[PDB]
Amino acid sequence: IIDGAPCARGSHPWQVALLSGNQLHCGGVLVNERWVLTAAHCKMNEYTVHLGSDTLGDRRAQRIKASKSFRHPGYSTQTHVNDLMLVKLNSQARLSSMVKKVRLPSRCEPPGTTCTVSGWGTTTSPDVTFPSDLMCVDVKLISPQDCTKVYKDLLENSMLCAGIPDSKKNACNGDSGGPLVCRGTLQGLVSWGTFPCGQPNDPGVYTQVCKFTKWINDTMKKHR
């Protein structure tokens, strides 16, 4: 997260991290006891899911293996369209005040809406600074018309853009697949942006969760 601050303790219980060799790989969101939602770009054959702590490396946290995952079949490595995947936890997440399911959206929140993106991704770019504590930054949803000025025809209708004018405030590598929450609901998954991160007037690009509700519920149902 570039130009953010530590999240208030206990306010991101639906936030998870995907680890590989005890190192941060991606962010993600807890959907229910058996499922984590993340970016298709985070695909691995095995995952270690960290749940229940704002601090990576906490002994208090749950560490659950995940040996199955399903990317949206329309996902493209070339364009990053349909960038989403469901990760199936080997055992159920043990829910508490620190482990909760995210509120999935019913509607798509409009341009100009204030949101919070969170994660343990680097806080600097190009040079890497990986924090221990979960970082937060507020961004505003950007219209597809305004976002097209920057990314042209790479942008699709199921992609959502967010950021702050003349600001470095954004998501970076390690935040990928993590949550963008607007008015109590999950509106996006960190998908991509420019590199180096935190480039002013270059929005962060997110997978628009409100357009994938059916595939999300249908995939959990079929692979239950």
Here the CATH number for the domain that contains residue 18 is: 2.40.10.10
176 is catalytic: yes
For the chain, the straight-line distance linking the first and the last C-alpha, in angstroms and rounded, comes to 33
Cα 140 to Cα 21: distance, rounded to the nearest angstrom:
34
Question: 53-81 as b/e, with b when 16 or more CB fall inside 10 Å?
Answer: bbbbeeeebbebebeebbbbeebeeeebb
Give residue 169's Cα distance to chain centre: 16
Domain identity same for 4 and 74? no
Resolution in A: 2.0
Domain identity same for 130 and 47? no
Cα 73 to Cα 133: distance, rounded to the nearest angstrom:
34
Structural domain count, the chain: 2
Domain identity same for 106 and 81? no
Domain identity same for 118 and 208? yes
The length of the chain in residues reads 224
Catalytically annotated residue among 25, 41, 72, 80? 41
Cα 175 to Cα 192: distance, rounded to the nearest angstrom:
10
Identify the sign of the CA torsion 71, 79, 23, 178. Answer: negative
Domain identity same for 190 and 114? yes
Identify the sign of the CA torsion 9, 220, 192, 49. Answer: positive
Domain identity same for 118 and 205? yes
41 is catalytic: yes
Domain identity same for 208 and 130? yes
Whether cis (ω within 30° of 0) applies to the bond prior to 196 is: yes
Residue 153, SS3? helix
Q: How was this structure determined?
A: X-ray
Cα 164 to Cα 153: distance, rounded to the nearest angstrom:
22
Domain identity same for 205 and 217? no
State which residues form the domain around 147.
Answer: 1-12+102-212
Catalytically annotated residue among 12, 50, 80, 83? 83
Domain identity same for 8 and 18? no
Domain identity same for 118 and 195? yes
Catalytically annotated residue among 69, 118, 176, 191? 176
Cα 16 to Cα 51: distance, rounded to the nearest angstrom:
5
Domain identity same for 23 and 121? no
Domain identity same for 217 and 201? no
